[PDB]
């Protein structure tokens, strides 16, 4: 929502959380409804089913 | 015990999109690895290695330290990607199987290296969760 790539990038490099898929799908709809292409490239490159 | 021909092999896709098909094989234990080397380097298609690094450890189950996570992210994968190498680990999540796999995913994301480190995995047949789809 802030359209800041560095926060989401760094929070995906944090190896403690074990990011679950439904949070990634929720943030993907936030990246697809709004015009943020760079988050779509980043979140799909993490690994996510379609 | 009776020795029978194999039934589990071929491609292997996951639900995650953007990637190729992985390759697996159900194999006997009392066999010779010369036909394993011919199967990998000829039939699937893989280059000859220049270095083989096998990674063992994993007393920390859920979380490993960030210092070793910096080593496994950068200092192992950059050498296995510059020299051209095979990192042989256990193919399951337990132990340092996750921290190697997360390190390869981190390095494949952090650069446009246009290649991936051939991280090979061995695993016993008995301890796979859902093997009935194979």
From Swiss-Prot, chain B:
ATP 2 binds at residue 105. It comes from the Eukaryota. Sino-atrial nodes (at protein level). Widely expressed. Changing residue 93 to A: Near loss of channel sensitivity to inhibition by ATP. It is found in: Cell membrane; Endoplasmic reticulum; Golgi apparatus. Calcium-activated selective cation channel that mediates membrane depolarization. While it is activated by increase in intracellular Ca(2+), it is impermeable to it. Mediates transport of monovalent cations (Na(+) > K(+) > Cs(+) > Li(+)), leading to depolarize the membrane. It thereby plays a central role in cadiomyocytes, neurons from entorhinal cortex, dorsal root and vomeronasal neurons, endocrine pancreas cells, kidney epithelial cells, cochlea hair cells etc. TRPM4, is a temperature-sensitive ion channel, it adopts distinct conformations at different temperatures, markedly influencing where and how ligands interact with it. Decavanadate (a positive modulator), ATP (an inhibitor) and Ca(2+) bind to different locations of TRPM4 at physiological temperatures or at lower temperatures. This is Transient receptor potential cation channel subfamily M member 4. The gene is Trpm4. The chain holds residues 68 to 201 of 1213 of the full protein.
